[PDB]
């Protein structure tokens, strides 16, 4: 297969600011990798991105009934689909699975990484805090970031750099909107 | 800024393949199967609360085909630049000796949206209970794809994620083991 490839993309983006208070519709016409024509509710008319998108913008701006439909689409299409999926998209709450374990088999007095495995949660908004015998530890926090699984679940690995002395208690505090009180999992050296 | 709902639509030539899909904060809500003409949701729970006319999605792909032909002639037959995919292998939950887990193969940042993904066990291919997601959109106009594999964690078996794309000179393999 040596034959060339040609791609055409059309995206209708509904941006929601502070719930439903401010709604922005963004229509995007993309050829291969470069965006040609676009519509913005804040603008109110079709504006060309590239030179190829110029005759399309002029053709669509001439007809007043095409523009009126796109302007009203923030309510008839954006605000409509928001309320339809509200129960399973915006209001989706999944309790995370918190697991605290050391990265490698290491004895006392020597360094090791404390892995606080947090997986299977929605939404992505999460606050993972580290505690050393009740007191908060802000230094040496190695986070892998936010990983989207694709199946409406998120996973994060927050690691803390520590030197266990004897019987030190390390607690991992997890704050998520699904839980009223923060989840705490303790690990003893 | 808070919540974004994207109506992703694409058409590729000369493969003659189309895709109609709805997005929510990166996650797929549903996609329309072009062959059997049905609304196939990402999760079974979604289909009970909402519905979509799958037949109407084909009318949008019909205009998407004619529009591609106009843009190809106007650009003087300019083809797409092959972008190599970024492959990462992760687990759904922290590994356990007895408890079952799912292997996630994250295929990110690639174009055109045609990829051959094969799950390998000790060099042999595995198709037992395999599940995959359709081509997801990106702000940089590239593509995203996920491949899942349900497996029993054993200390004797090894895993590989074979990824084939035009952006790669040779097929890419991402390894995972206990």
């Amino acid at each position: 297969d040596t034959r060339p490839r040609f791609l055409w993309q059309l995206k209708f983006e509904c941006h929601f600011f502070n719930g439903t208070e401010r709604v922005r519709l963004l229509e995007r016409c993309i050829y291969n990798q470069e965006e040609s024509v676009r519509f913005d509710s804040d603008v109110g008319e079709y504006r060309a991105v590239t030179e190829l998108g110029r005759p399309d913008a002029e053709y669509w701006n001439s007809q007043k009934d095409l523009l009126e439909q796109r302007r009203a689409a923030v309510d008839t299409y954006c605000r409509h689909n928001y309320g339809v999926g509200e129960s399973f998209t915006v209001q989706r709450r999944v309790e995370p699975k918190v697991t605290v374990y050391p990265s490698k088999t290491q004895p006392l007095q020597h360094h090791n990484l404390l892995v606080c495995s947090v997986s299977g949660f929605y939404p992505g908004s999460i606050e993972v805090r580290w505690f050393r015998n009740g007191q908060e530890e802000k230094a040496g926090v190695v986070s892998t970031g936010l990983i989207q699984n694709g199946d409406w679940t998120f996973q994060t690995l927050v690691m803390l750099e520590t030197v266990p002395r004897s019987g030190e208690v390390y607690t991992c505090q997890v704050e998520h909107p699904s839980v009223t009180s923060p989840l705490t999992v303790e690990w003893r050296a | 800024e808070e919540h974004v709902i994207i109506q992703a639509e694409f058409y590729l030539n000369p493969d003659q393949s189309g895709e109609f899909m709805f997005d929510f904060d990166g996650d797929e809500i549903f996609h329309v199967d072009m062959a059997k003409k049905e609304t196939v949701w990402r999760l079974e729970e979604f289909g009970r609360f909402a519905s979509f006319e799958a037949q109407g999605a084909l009318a949008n792909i019909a205009v998407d085909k004619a529009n591609l032909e106009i843009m190809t002639k106007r650009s003087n037959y300019t083809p797409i630049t092959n972008v190599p995919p970024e492959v990462t292998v992760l687990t759904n939950s922290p590994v356990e000796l007895r408890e079952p887990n799912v292997l996630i193969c994250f295929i990110d940042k690639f174009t055109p949206p045609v990829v051959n993904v094969t799950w390998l066990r000790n060099g042999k291919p595995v198709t037992t209970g395999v599940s995959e997601t359709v081509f997801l959109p990106r702000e940089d106009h590239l593509f995203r794809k996920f491949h899942y594999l349900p497996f029993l964690p054993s200390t004797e078996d090894v895993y590989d994620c074979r990824v084939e794309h035009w952006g790669l000179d040779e097929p890419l393999l991402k390894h995972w083991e206990f």
Binding site: - | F20, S51, E53, V63
Partner: peptide, 13 residues
């Protein structure tokens, strides 16, 4: 509750 789609526009010829 039905999901609403946006109709695609034909380019200038």
């Amino acid at each position: 509750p039905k999901y609403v789609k946006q109709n695609t526009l034909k380019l200038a010829t």
